[PDB]
Structures are given as structure tokens and as C-alpha cells.
Design a binder for this molecule. Structure first.
Ligand SMILES: [Mn+2]
Ligand SMILES: [Mn+2]
Lengths: 579, 488, 308
């Protein structure tokens, strides 16, 4: 309410005290009336302030929300003087915040004062002396184009063409970054005559950092043109961008390749995009081969169905037989993430003849990330070929990966094991795969041990309780006499997940005498894991055994020497309501 | 009289564990636009030829060495075709330095074409990782695999420029603005031996081509503007600043408005990049050489350094204090009184710092008797700024070396002038709650709401790359220091 | 001890496991809680038989969470760390806050020792003082942690047979009773018996040598063979040194260097290791690779150094 008090607080020589007093600029404007903040507060921000860039960043973030505190959407052009000064500041985090706030303010404008206050603001930033103002002018053409008159929007196209032909490459890099966004609000005959010559010039630019941004503009331009003139306008620019001498432009064609396939159409994809895709997979730079290997599944999914399996088997598949044996490890790992996904496209018999040797060659690769990516999609080939064919060709490679050196590869087989065991049947699992799941429980890595206990819960839901009682219950109860204390707790961890699925009778008569026996274990870590397990399997037992066999053990563990055994037993007595 | 500090090739302190070694850091992908046929027989020698078939033999030796070979994919392919280029490149280097009147104007297009097909290329992806968790000083350099041939092309072009019969009026139609821009794109090369030849070649091109000087200075600014504001990653900032340090020493003394805007808007925002420690001895030379040229720029330099003063980066705060003492060594007494209250409010925060390297670097200003000269002529208002910073922290510091330096700094103030005032007891205690006068009015605004020294340096324990290191010490430099280039 | 504090303390461990730092007032209350626990610990701490022994972590939090996936979670697996938890990494604050919070909550299950980087001077040369400035805005959390570091025990004695410490031996110490006579509640000196216990190294030279680290000594095989016989020791486990395999035997299997930071400083490309002692004190080493990095490595304009 006094203006002469807070003018010195916002001009205080401490920098932090100017920062807190300007982050609370909404509460100062709320205390002032909506007419005096136009006449005193906003000219003060216009005239006086210029400071540290942390203050200017906080100032630009506040003024994007002042559209109600200034008097509503018909007085919002008073926020344009201060925001124009922050759009020319050299630091890039404040002039990006100022151009972000300038777009939010522009929607509150009328269509009449857009041509009176916002369009002259864009034309003054676009004709500024320094490049920091011309860069901030590039992000303001799309939010003010489609609401102005035809004579004004003819001037906006001229001022955008001057930014695309700028002297400095910093503005040309920012004009090309907003070329696709600006082209989506133009009419069709003006994209065809004004956007195309300024898109074709930015793709023949001397700086490759400008040329690669014209490739991302080629996706947005081609998707709003009709299919008949894509050959005479867009296609010679895209054909010379795939053959560019800079690898950074060839990387952007390969990274945006599936978006170029949907935007252009299915007919020019057969003619031009398929031979251009072969040259990107056989590229001299390993970064371009890895980018063209990520797209090898999605490119073949969206081909025309009249010629899908003929193009893949004759043009694509000879090129991916050489990316399997590539020298670089990123291209081998990128192909392996998506090579199993083109198994439903080729069919059953083409997968056995042509794709199955490529899968076995990557299940035995020396890189662990190639082996990780090829396991994670093993169900997708399982629905194409049968379980009789999976068990013949790929199952000796899966059993061999169950004892892999890297534990992440061992973990990927365990997560696939309940899906594989359900299809193979219980008579095949007990003979050839049951010893694999029991050998994971005594592994050295703990994350393999805890993934094998959760594997035992998923196995008995698919096979039943009486399969567990005859096969895997006496295997995990003999683990309680292991002289390593890390494996004695695995018996307790197995009982925590098996008790909820094998019911009350198997828990009381087979697993409860084991958790009560090892409550006199010498290691203290086993002794409170007994008390943490009696809390877990407690509700599954009935009230008769909970008061005569569980409660006298939990009372003895509260007299233990160790403080953590004494705590967890006392915690289990209240959860079991035995206090 | 003064030269810029020469940029070191290997800037990593390797005093950690030397028993662990790396695997040579081999480049992965080779190149674009290679040749198919690489057949090359040995042409006859230039010295043994008669004196009239000299330039056509020299053209055919320069029509050779434009076929590019492969050192990356198959490192031992075409060893007899690679050695005839290596012996041919070594023949043309030895031919151009000793003999006289060997360059005709029909040699100028071929020597530029031989340079432009061998070196002008798209640099391969950076093998060093990027991110906030990576120290930019500990980036291991990756040597160029074609350096058995690329070194002798740089060596040939440098002796071509420095020949006494070089005519810059003939060569200015082939060395044009497209040649310079393609040469400036190679300064991001990760090979430090490649950046050393480009620094010497660009120094000769700027020295002899007066029509390219305004273009070279503009394209260097575009490299720094992208580096400061967009990417924050460039391997040759220290090499370009060593070139610019020789340009500043040759500026005309009524300094132009183009050069003053280069100091304020390019050189001063280079202090805020995270990798300032890579190029700081070259950047601090260019700033000081401006103030030796025109001392009127001392005020916007110091208030620009205090604007970019680092607060979450203590090795950069020591580098700011090191550069600020070099500015204060050459400051005029009239410029000192215009800037000393923003200057000594920052030094009050640096003396009272918990960081022992920041505190001991600012307390070493009192050993500089020229800075203590200007303090004694301004002690009426430079002492009430520094006296609370030294007296509130005389005994409260964990390091006991700073206990000595604060007492050493406090006794130089009492012997300077007997300002033995004891009004620190009220002007702190009254302003305990004078900031609480403004706090209750801060709450009063909510009352009307509506409508809602081996251990003293950071070493690297990375394993060394002993093949790369001894290759960096075997590389003799092109020139030890860059001489000044006078403005026309 | 009191029950409403442990449910607050269990929330901090769960919050810290998501790589989320604690507040400045929570670090101050934590470091004073750990100060009462560590001030009644001897200079040589007695640890029971089943324990997992770890080396330098050096702020690599995502490789510390990988370490708990090889050896097990913290109350279930007894751990013993050998200093160097706060430096040479991006997440030094979240690494040392979790390891101290496990010590307050599980004081019989964790034993944290002092390394050379838990001093005031070494932690300001490298990037832990700047990390508390970047993450908290001032230098109070640095003052809370480095005053806690004075109370950390120097050495540890597992079952009376295995001697665990950060650096190595010293010419001023020849008996475990001489480590008990030291005063450890101070900043790490530049020379003396306490300095060489966190700075020394083994080598193959014999006798006392000049430690190139600038602080410390180097001891040969004839010293560790003499130190083991005079105290009844079978092994002097250590760390402090980068080893490529993760662990390394030296001096006719009298000392072993354990390093638990895989891909040290995200440059080195080394493996890590932890030493597991079972109930009858037989050692076994589990090597592991770095954790896979998951997230959005996009171009994020770093906040500048002059914003505070
Ligand atoms: Mn260490
Ligand atoms: Mn250490």
C-alpha cells in the first residue's frame, strides 16, 4: 500500500532479499488494487529493474500469471513492455522463460490488439540488433499467426523468412527449430510456396547443426501436404539429407525414419524409403547404424500388406544378417531389442528357417546387453512357432543361460520361467527344469535368491499345492541346515511366500515346525527373521496353534540379548494380538 | 613484449596410481566419402628432376596424397600404398623449406585442394561422456588414427604459409571465407596435436590475409556464442583464446566499439561455463590485455566478474580470486575508488568463507603491497567493510592456518590508521531487529489479501593411457608463442 | 530406542532409498543421534562373525543400491564399511545420509569406519562441500556431517582374527592396544599415527617407504607379516586403493584390498567386490558390475554457478 517502502526492498543491496521479495510479487499485486498495479507497479518493473539473472528469471516466471491481477484479458497488453526487456537478456534461461510467458499472455489477447500490441512486439524482436532478441522472436510466430488478418499475416511470413536467412547461425538454428510448428498454422497454398523454399534453403545450409534441424521439420511439412506433390517438393530434399556428408544429419534421418514413413505414405516408401533404409543400416558411422537398428521392427510393421513379406525377405533381412555380426556393441544391442518383434510378420516357417539362427547367434553373444534384450521378448516368438518348436531349438540355449556369468542375464531367465513352465507341462518341468529352479535358491547374488522365491510362488499357482508338497517343500526345508546364515534366511523367505498359497494344512504341519526350530539359531539375523516370519504366516494358522506354539516362542525372543531380536519379537506380538 | 600462455596438450594431473593402464582409446568409425581405387606408385624425386619439369612434377605429387586411406577399420591395409603417400608428403615438406622460387600460381589451387580433401571432414562422435557428474578436466583425449598422414599435411601447409615467396594476393582467391569456416570447425577435434597445428595455421592466416580479419573475428564469436549459451562443450576454447590474445595486443589504441563489445558480451560471459578451468589461463590473459590497452574498461570488467561470481563451485571461486588480483595489480587509483565498494563486499564474503582454499586466497591479497597501497588511501570506507568480516571470524574457523592469516590481516589495519572503533556491539544488535522491522511489514502485506601442498589440489585417480601420453610428449609444437598482429 | 522415533527413522531410510535427500533440520537431528552412538565406540570396534565387508563407495549411490542387491538388505545382512563414502560421485549427500541413518537404526548391524575423505580438508578439495552447497543452499549440512566424522571409529576387529581399517599400518603403531590409546575425536592430522591409519598403502618394496599420496607411508610384506604375528591376526582387510578386479590379495595373502565402487568416478571401468565372512569366518568375494542407468539423458540446461 505504500509505494515508497517496497521500492527500496526490491532495490535492497542483498541479492537474496531481492529474490524472496520478488517471488512474492503476486501477494504485492493482490494487496494493491488492479488499477494501481498498472500505473505504479508495472512501470516500476519496466523502468527500474535490471539485476542478477536469478532475479530476472524469477521476474519472468511471475509475469506469465499476471493476466488476472492486471485487470483481466482486456488490459493484458500492459505486461508486454517488461516481458520484451526480458526476452532480450543474454542469459538463455531467462529469455526462454520470457518467451514462454509471452505465449501464455498471447492467448488472452483480443484478435484486435494482437495486431496492435503483440505483432509490433514480434517485429521489434525480429529486427533487433543482437541475436538474443532475434532468437526469442522465433518462438512467437505460431501463437499469433492464425488470429490476425490476411495483410498482417502476410507480414509475419516475411519476418519469418528474414530469420531463416539470418547472418548468424544462432538465429538460423532457432528459425529451423520452429519451422515445422510455424508451418502447421499456415494455409496449404502458402506452405507450398513460402515454407518449401525456406525449408529447402535451411537443408542446404553450411552449418550441419542447422541442416539436421531441417530434417525434423521435414516430418511436419510432409504430413500436411497431399501425396501428389510430395515427390516434387519434399522428396529431393529428403533424398539428399540421407546422403549428407555429416553423420549428424544422417543420424537425424535414421532417428526420424518411422515418422517419415507414416507422413510420406505407403507408395513412396516402397520406391525411395526402402533403398534409403538399406544405406542407413550399412552406414560408415556406428551411431547411424545403431539408430537405424532401433527402427527395424516398426519400419517393417507399417509396410504395405500386399508386399510386406516380399520386401522384408529380399531387402531388409540380408541387411539385418550383417548387423548381428557387427563389430560395435551398441548396434548389436539395439537390433536385439527389436529383432524378435518381426517374428509374427514373417510367419511360422520363415521364423524357423531365417530368424531362428539369428536368435541363437545372439543368445550366445559376448555382450551381456545383447543377451538381455533377446531374452525379454521370448514370448513373442513363442506365439508364432509352437511350444514343440521352442523346446527343440531354443530351450538348450535357455537352460545354458540359467548359469550365466552376469547375474542380470540369470535374472531374465527366472522372470521367464513361470511362463515357460506353464506351457511345457508339469511332467516336463519335473524332469528337466526342476533342478534349475532349486539351484537358484542357493545363488551367491541376493537378487537372484529373492527372485527365485517369488518364482516359487508363481510356479505353485500353475501346478497346485500337492505338487509343491511332493517336490519343492522338502527341497526348501533341507536348506535350513546350511552353515551359511544367508541361506538359512532363504528358508524363511521361501516360507513367507509359500504359506499364502499352500494353505493352512501344509503351513501348519510342514513349514511351521521349521520356523519354530530355528528360533534358537546362533546368528541374531536369523532370530528376528523368525519373528518377522511368524508375523507373516501368523494369520494363516488357526488360533489354537497361534496361542500354544507361536506365542511361547515370541515370548522367549523378547528375552533375547540382541536389541533387534527384542524389537521385532515385540512388534510381532502386537500385530498377532498376543500381548 | 608479452605473449599469451601456451596451451598444454595434456591437461590432467596424473599423480595417482600408475600401475593401471588403459587400452589405447582406439577410434571406432573411420570416415565418410573415401575413395575406391588407391593405387599409387612412386613418382620420381623433385630434387633429382631437371629444372623445367619442376612444377608439373610438384602438381603430380600434389595430385597424389588426395586419396584418403583407412587407418581405423583395418589398420594394416595397403601398407605399400600408405608409405608412398607418407614418403611423398615428407618429400614435399623438405622441398618447400630449402629451395627458392618453387611456388607458381598454378601450385596455389593444388595445395589448397590437398588440404581440403585430407583434413576438412566431419569430426567423429565424442568418446568422452557428457553430463553434470563428469569433471571436464578429466576427459581423456582421443588421438586421430590417421596422424601418420595428417601430421605431414599440417606440416606441409604451415611451411607453405611461412615460405618467403608466398603471395597472399594470389592465395586469397583460394583461401576464402569457405576455407576459413571449414577450418574453424576442426577446432572441436579431440586430438590435442591437431588443435595445436590449427592454432598456428589460423594465426598465420589472420596475419597475412587482411580481407579475412573481420570474418575470422566474427566466426570465432559465433563459436563462443554457441559454446556459452547452447552446448557448453567445445574442445578448443583454450586454443582460440590463445589466438585472440595475440589479436588484442595489436589493437589500435583508440579502441573500436566492435572490440569493446567483444570484451563485455563474449569474454566476460565465458567465465560462467562449467569448464572454465580448462581455458582459464588463456581467458585471464585476454581480459588483462584489454585493461592494459584501455584502463577505462576496468569498471565494467570488475562489475561483470562480480555478477558471474560462482556460489556452488569452489574451484571456480579460487580462479576468480586469482584473476581479480591480476586486474587489481594494473588498476589505476581513480578506477579503484569507483568500484571498491562492490569489490570489497565480495572480499568480505570470501575472507569469512568456510572453504579454506577460498579464504586463504582472498587473505593473500594483504601480502600484495600495491593493493594495500590503495586500501590505505581509501581506509575511511574500505575498513568498515572488511573489519566485521575479519573480527567476527578471528577464532571461529576449523583450519588454524586461517587463524594466522586473519590475525596477520587485522594487525595491518591497525598499523595503517588507528581506527580502534568498538561500535560493532550496537550496529549488529540494532540490525538484529531492524530486519525485523521489515519482517512485520512483510506480514502486513498479507493483511489486505483479496480475490483468491600435494593434498591441496584435486587429483585424478583414473588409469593412465601411457601410449596416448608419450605420444603427446613426443609431439613438438608448431610455435611456442603467438606473436602480436597489428590492426590495420 | 523410543518407538515414535524409529517409525520416523524408518521413513527416512525408505525416503533415502529413492535417492531423495533429507531436509536440513533432519540431517541435524540425525547427526546428533549418531553422535551419541559413535561416542561410546572404541577406536578398534569389535564386530561379530557373520558380516559383509565393503570398501570405498565414494558417493556412487546407484552402485550402493546395487551393492545391496548382491549382499542383501541392511537389517538382514550385517555390513561393515571402510570409509570414503562422501566424494568422487554425484550423490555424495544421499550416500552418507543413508549409511549414517542405517547406523542409528541398526547399530548392531552396521559398522561404519573412518576413511581419509572423512576429514574437513580433503572433503573441501574435492566435491562434497560444493555438493552440500548445491543441494542445500548453505554450508550447514557440511558442518553437521564433518563434525559427525570426528566420532567415527578408526579400525575394526572381526572375531579377533580379521583386522579391518581404511588405509594401512604405521611405524608408530605396532599393537592393537596402541590404537586404543589414540585420541580420535579430532580432524585427521597431516602426520602421526592416526593419519597413517587412513592413508597408508601396501607395496612390494619392503620396509617403510615414502607414501606418494603425500600423507601416509608404504609398508612391505615383512611389516604385515610382523604385524599379524604380534597381535594374533590372520588377515588385515583394507581398501583405499583402486583395484580393477574389485579385490586384490597382497603380501603372501596377509592383506586384501577391497574396492566397492564399480566404474570409479564413472570413468575407470573397473569391477567392485565385497567380502562375505560366514559364521565360521571363511571369506568369499562377490564381484559386481555397475547398475544400469535408467531415466531421460536429454539436453538439460544446467543451472549456472552464480545462481544462489
Ligand atoms: Mn577412496
Ligand atoms: Mn581413501
Amino acid at each position: 500500500y505504500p509505494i515508497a517502502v517496497l521500492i527500496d526492498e526490491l532495490r535492497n543491496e542483498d541479492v537474496q532479499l531481492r529474490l524472496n521479495s520478488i517471488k512474492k510479487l503476486s501477494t504485492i499485486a493482490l494487496a494493491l488494487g488492479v488499477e494501481r498495479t498498472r500505473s505504479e507497479l508495472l512501470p516500476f518493473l519496466t523502468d527500474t529493474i535490471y539485476d542478477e539473472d536469478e532475479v530476472l528469471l524469477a521476474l519472468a516466471e511471475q509475469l506469465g500469471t499476471f493476466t488476472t491481477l492486471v485487470g483481466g484479458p482486456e488490459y493484458v497488453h500492459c505486461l508486454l513492455p517488461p516481458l520484451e526487456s526480458l526476452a532480450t537478456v543474454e542469459e538463455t534461461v531467462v529469455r526462454d522463460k520470457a518467451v514462454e510467458s509471452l505465449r501464455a499472455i498471447s492467448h488472452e489477447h483480443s484478435p484486435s490488439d494482437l495486431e496492435a500490441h503483440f505483432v509490433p512486439l514480434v517485429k521489434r524482436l525480429a529486427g533487433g540488433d543482437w541475436f538474443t532478441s532475434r532468437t526469442s522472436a522465433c518462438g512467437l510466430f505460431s501463437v499469433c499467426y492464425p488470429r490476425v488478418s490476411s495483410a498482417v499475416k502476410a507480414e509475419l511470413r516475411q519476418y519469418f523468412r528474414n530469420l531463416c536467412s539470418d547472418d548468424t547461425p544462432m538465429v538460423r538454428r532457432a528459425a529451423a527449430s520452429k519451422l515445422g510448428e510455424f508451418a502447421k498454422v499456415l494455409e496449404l497454398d502458402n506452405v507450398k510456396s513460402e515454407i518449401i523454399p525456406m525449408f529447402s534453403n535451411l537443408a542446404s545450409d553450411e552449418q550441419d547443426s542447422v541442416r539436421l534441424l531441417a530434417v525434423e521439420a521435414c516430418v511436419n511439412i510432409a504430413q500436411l501436404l497431399p501425396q501428389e506433390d510430395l515427390e516434387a517438393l519434399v522428396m529431393p530434399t529428403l533424398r539428399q539429407a540421407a546422403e549428407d556428408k555429416s553423420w549428424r544429419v544422417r543420424y537425424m534421418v535414421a532417428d526420424k525414419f518411422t515418422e517419415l514413413q507414416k507422413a510420406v505414405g505407403p507408395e513412396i516408401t516402397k520406391t525411395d524409403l526402402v533403398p534409403a533404409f538399406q544405406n542407413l543400416m550399412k552406414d560408415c558411422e556406428a551411431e547411424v547404424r545403431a539408430a537405424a537398428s532401433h527402427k527395424v521392427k516398426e519400419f517393417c510393421e507399417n509396410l504395405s500388406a500386399d508386399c510386406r513379406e516380399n520386401v522384408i525377405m529380399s531387402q531388409i533381412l540380408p541387411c539385418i544378417k550383417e548387423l548381428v555380426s557387427d563389430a560395435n556393441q551398441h548396434v548389436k544391442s539395439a537390433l536385439a531389442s527389436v529383432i524378435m518383434g518381426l517374428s509374427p510378420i514373417l510367419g511360422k516357417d520363415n521364423t524357423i528357417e531365417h530368424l531362428l539362427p539369428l536368435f541363437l547367434a545372439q543368445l550366445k553373444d559376448e555382450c551381456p546387453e545383447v543377451r538381455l534384450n533377446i531374452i525379454s521378448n521370448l514370448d513373442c516368438v513363442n506365439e508364432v512357432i509352437g511350444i514343440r518348436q521352442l523346446s527343440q531349438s531354443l530351450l538348450p540355449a535357455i537352460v545354458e543361460l540359467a548359469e550365466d556369468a552376469k547375474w542380470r542375464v540369470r535374472l531374465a531367465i527366472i522372470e521367464y520361467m513361470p511362463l515357460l513352465a506353464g506351457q511345457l507341462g508339469v511332467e516336463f518341468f519335473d524332469e528337466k527344469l526342476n533342478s534349475l529352479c532349486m539351484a537358484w535358491l542357493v545363488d551367491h547374488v541376493y537378487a537372484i535368491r529373492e527372485a527365485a522365491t517369488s518364482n516359487l510362488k508363481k510356479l505353485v499357482e500353475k501346478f497346485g499345492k500337492e505338487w509343491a508338497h511332493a517336490t519343492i517343500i522338502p527341497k526348501v526345508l533341507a536348506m535350513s541346515g546350511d552353515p551359511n546364515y544367508l541361506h538359512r534366511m532363504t528358508t524363511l523367505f521361501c516360507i513367507n511366500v509359500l504359506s499364502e498359497v499352500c494353505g493352512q494344512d501344509i503351513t501348519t504341519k510342514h513349514m511351521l515346525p521349521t520356523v519354530l526350530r530355528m528360533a534358537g539359531d546362533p546368528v541374531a539375523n536369523v532370530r528376528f527373521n523368525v519373528a518377522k516370519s511368524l508375523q507373516k504366516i501368523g494369520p494363516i494358522l488357526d488360533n489354537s496353534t497361534l496361542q500354544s506354539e507361536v506365542k511361547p516362542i515370541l515370548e522367549k525372543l523378547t528375552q533375547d540379548q540382541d536389541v533387534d531380536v527384542k524389537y521385532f519379537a515385540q512388534e510381532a506380538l502386537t500385530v498377532l494380538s498376543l500381548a | 613484449n608479452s605473449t599469451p600462455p601456451p596451451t598444454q596438450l595434456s591437461k590432467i594431473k596424473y599423480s595417482g596410481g600408475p600401475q593401471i593402464v588403459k587400452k589405447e582409446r582406439r577410434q571406432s568409425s573411420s570416415r565418410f566419402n573415401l575413395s575406391k581405387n588407391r593405387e599409387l606408385q612412386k613418382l620420381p624425386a623433385l630434387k633429382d628432376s631437371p629444372t623445367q619439369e619442376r612444377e608439373e612434377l610438384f602438381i603430380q605429387k600434389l595430385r597424389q596424397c588426395c586419396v584418403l586411406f583407412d587407418f581405423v577399420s583395418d589398420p594394416l591395409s595397403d601398407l605399400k600404398f600408405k608409405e608412398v603417400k607418407r614418403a611423398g608428403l615428407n618429400e614435399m615438406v623438405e622441398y618447400i623449406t630449402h629451395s627458392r622460387d618453387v611456388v607458381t600460381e598454378a601450385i596455389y589451387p593444388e595445395a589448397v585442394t590437398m588440404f581440403s580433401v585430407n583434413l576438412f571432414r566431419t569430426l567423429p562422435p565424442s568418446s568422452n561422456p557428457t553430463g553434470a557428474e563428469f569433471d571436464p578436466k578429466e576427459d581423456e583425449p582421443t588421438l586421430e588414427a590417421a596422424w601418420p598422414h595428417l601430421q605431414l599435411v599440417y606440416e606441409f601447409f604451415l611451411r607453405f604459409l611461412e615460405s618467403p615467396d608466398f603471395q597472399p594476393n594470389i592465395a586469397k582467391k583460394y583461401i576464402d571465407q569457405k576455407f576459413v569456416l571449414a577450418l574453424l570447425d576442426l577446432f572441436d577435434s579431440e586430438d590435442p596435436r591437431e588443435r595445436d597445428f590449427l592454432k598456428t595455421i589460423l594465426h598465420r592466416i589472420y596475419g597475412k590475409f587482411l580481407g579475412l580479419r573481420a570474418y575470422i573475428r566474427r566466426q570465432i564469436n559465433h563459436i563462443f556464442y554457441r559454446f556459452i549459451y547452447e552446448t557448453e562443450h567445445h574442445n578448443g576454447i583454450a586454443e582460440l583464446l590463445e589466438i585472440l590474445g595475440s589479436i588484442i595486443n595489436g589493437f589500435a589504441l583508440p579502441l573500436k566499439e566492435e572490440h569493446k563489445m567483444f570484451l563485455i558480451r563474449v569474454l566476460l560471459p565465458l567465465h560462467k561455463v562449467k569448464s572454465l578451468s580448462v581455458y582459464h589461463p588463456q581467458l585471464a590473459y585476454c581480459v588483462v590485455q584489454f585493461l592494459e590497452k584501455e584502463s577505462s574498461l576496468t569498471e565494467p570488467v570488475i562489475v561483470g566478474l562480480l555478477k558471474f561470481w560462482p556460489k556452488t563451485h569452489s574451484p571456480k571461486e579460487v580462479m576468480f580470486l586469482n584473476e581479480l588480483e591480476e586486474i587489481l595489480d594494473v588498476i589505476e587509483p581513480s578506477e579503484f575508488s569507483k568500484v571498491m565498494e562492490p569489490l570489497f563486499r565480495q572480499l568480505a564474503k570470501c575472507v569469512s568463507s568456510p572453504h579454506f582454499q577460498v579464504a586463504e586466497r582472498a587473505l593473500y591479497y594483504w601480502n600484495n603491497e600495491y593493493i594495500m597501497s590503495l586500501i590505505s588511501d581509501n581506509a575511511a570506507r574500505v575498513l568498515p567493510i572488511m573489519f566485521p568480516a575479519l573480527y567476527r571470524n578471528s577464532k571461529s574457523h576449523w583450519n588454524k592456518t586461517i587463524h594466522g592469516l586473519i590475525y596477520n590481516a587485522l594487525k595491518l589495519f591497525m598499523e595503517m590508521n588507528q581506527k580502534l572503533f568498538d561500535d560493532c556491539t550496537q550496529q549488529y544488535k540494532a540490525e538484529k531487529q531492524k530486519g525485523r522491522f521489515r519482517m512485520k511489514e512483510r506480514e502486513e502485506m498479507w493483511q489486505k489479501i483479496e480475490e483468491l601442498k600435494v593434498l591441496l589440489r584435486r587429483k585424478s585417480e583414473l588409469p593412465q593411457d601411457v601410449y596416448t601420453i608419450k605420444a603427446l610428449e613426443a609431439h613438438k609444437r608448431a610455435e611456442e608463442f603467438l606473436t602480436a598482429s597489428q590492426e590495420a | 530406542d523410543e518407538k515414535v522415533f524409529t517409525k520416523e527413522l524408518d521413513q527416512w531410510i525408505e525416503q533415502l532409498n529413492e535417492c531423495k535427500q533429507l531436509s536440513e533440520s533432519q540431517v541435524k537431528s540425525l547427526c546428533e543421534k549418531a553422535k551419541e552412538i559413535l561416542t561410546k565406540e572404541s577406536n578398534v570396534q569389535e564386530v561379530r562373525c557373520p558380516v559383509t565387508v565393503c570398501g570405498d563407495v565414494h558417493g556412487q549411490f546407484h552402485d550402493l543400491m546395487e551393492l545391496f542387491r548382491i549382499g542383501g538388505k541392511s537389517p538382514d545382512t550385517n555390513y561393515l564399511f571402510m570409509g570414503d563414502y562422501v566424494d568422487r560421485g554425484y550423490y555424495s549427500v544421499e550416500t552418507v545420509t543413508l549409511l549414517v541413518a542405517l547406523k542409528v537404526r541398526y547399530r548392531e548391524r552396521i559398522t561404519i569406519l573412518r576413511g581419509n575423505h572423512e576429514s574437513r580438508q580433503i572433503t573441501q578439495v574435492y566435491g562434497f562441500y560444493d555438493e552440500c552447497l548445491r543441494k542445500y543452499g548453505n554450508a550447514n549440512v557440511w558442518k553437521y556431517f564433518t563434525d559427525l566424522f570426528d566420532y567415527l571409529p578408526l579400525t575394526a576387529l572381526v572375531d579377533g582374527q580379521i583386522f579391518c581399517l581404511h588405509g594401512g599400518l604405521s611405524p608408530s603403531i605396532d599393537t592393537l592396544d596402541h590404537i586404543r590409546a589414540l585420541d580420535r575425536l579430532q580432524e585427521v592430522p597431516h602426520e602421526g599415527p592416526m593419519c597413517d591409519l587412513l592413508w597408508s598403502d601396501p607395496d612390494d618394496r619392503g620396509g617403510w617407504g615414502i607414501s606418494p599420496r603425500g600423507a601416509g607411508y608404504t609398508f612391505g610384506q615383512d611389516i604385515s607379516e610382523t604385524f599379524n604375528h604380534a597381535n594374533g591376526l590372520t588377515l588385515v582387510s583394507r581398501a583405499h586403493q583402486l583395484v580393477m578386479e574389485g579385490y586384490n590379495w597382497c603380501h603372501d595373502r596377509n592383506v586384501v584390498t577391497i574396492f566397492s565402487a564399480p566404474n570409479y568416478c564413472y570413468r575407470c571401468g573397473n569391477q567392485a567386490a565385497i567380502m562375505e565372512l560366514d559364521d565360521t569366518l571363511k571369506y568369499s568375494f562377490l564381484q559386481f558390475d555397475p547398475a544400469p542407468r535408467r531415466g531421460e539423458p536429454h539436453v538439460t540446461r544446467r543451472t549456472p554457478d552464480y545462481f544462489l
